[PDB]
Design a protein around this nucleic acid. Structure first.
Length: 162
RNA sequence: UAUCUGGUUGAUCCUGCCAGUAGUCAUAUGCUUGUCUCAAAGUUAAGCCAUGCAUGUCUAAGUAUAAGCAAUUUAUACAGU
């Protein structure tokens, strides 16, 4: 089921005549919890506009992930596949699958990517600068997925000819 | 298996130093001061030290205080070898 969960805003000050106006740069993470996530950021005048702008554009940039059973475990049960590192600016996000019962251990940016992907038991690490709007979230989205980042290892054999 | 924030700007992103968040100490100081168990308690002048105490024990190593000889002390059923 599609869950919209809001991360944060910054109040973006623009200098204009007589005084400043505001604009809001909103971050909303979409996900299914079965095995899809969604990245969306856009701006607007008000907070009420910016949230809706981040909601809709996240449903374009939908990423499948290999988690869960189809029949047999084609995705890893309640965890990520392998480990993946990924840079995006002066920012790195690193990942590791955990055993079951651990729960979702992560930074508050990457946490709502993982739980809305359905990924329960993981440890998650960032290093360096953490710039939450842009860099860590972009880095985590290119690290977590199937189209980006992870491969399972079944699809690795399916793609060549046996 | 490792999550950073604030301060150089009109604003932004880097570089970079500083300040703060944590855990710890034979502890010390301000303040308040109600208990217990366990553990610890001169880091400075290996500086100068009063007084009392920290090193003794055996008579089971011997003559063997009879036979013979001064004085004093202790023990007993009687000898007290």
């Amino acid at each position: 089921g599609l869950q919209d969960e809001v991360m944060n805003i910054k109040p973006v000050q623009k200098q204009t005549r007589a005084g400043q106006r505001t604009r809001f740069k909103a971050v909303v993470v979409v996900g299914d919890s079965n095995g899809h996530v969604g990245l969306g950021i856009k701006t607007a005048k008000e907070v009420a506009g910016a949230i809706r702008a981040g909601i809709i554009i996240a449903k374009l940039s939908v990423i499948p992930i290999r988690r869960g059973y189809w029949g047999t475990n084609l995705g890893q049960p309640h965890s990520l596949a392998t480990k993946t590192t990924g840079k995006c600016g002066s920012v790195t996000v690193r990942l590791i699958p955990a055993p079951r019962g651990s729960g979702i251990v992560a930074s508050p940016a990457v946490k709502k990517l993982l739980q809305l992907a359905g990924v329960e038991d993981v440890y998650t690490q960032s290093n360096g600068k953490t710039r939450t709007l842009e860099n860590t979230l972009k880095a985590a989205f290119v690290a977590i997925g199937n189209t980006y980042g992870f491969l399972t290892p079944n699809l690795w054999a399916e793609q060549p000819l046996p």
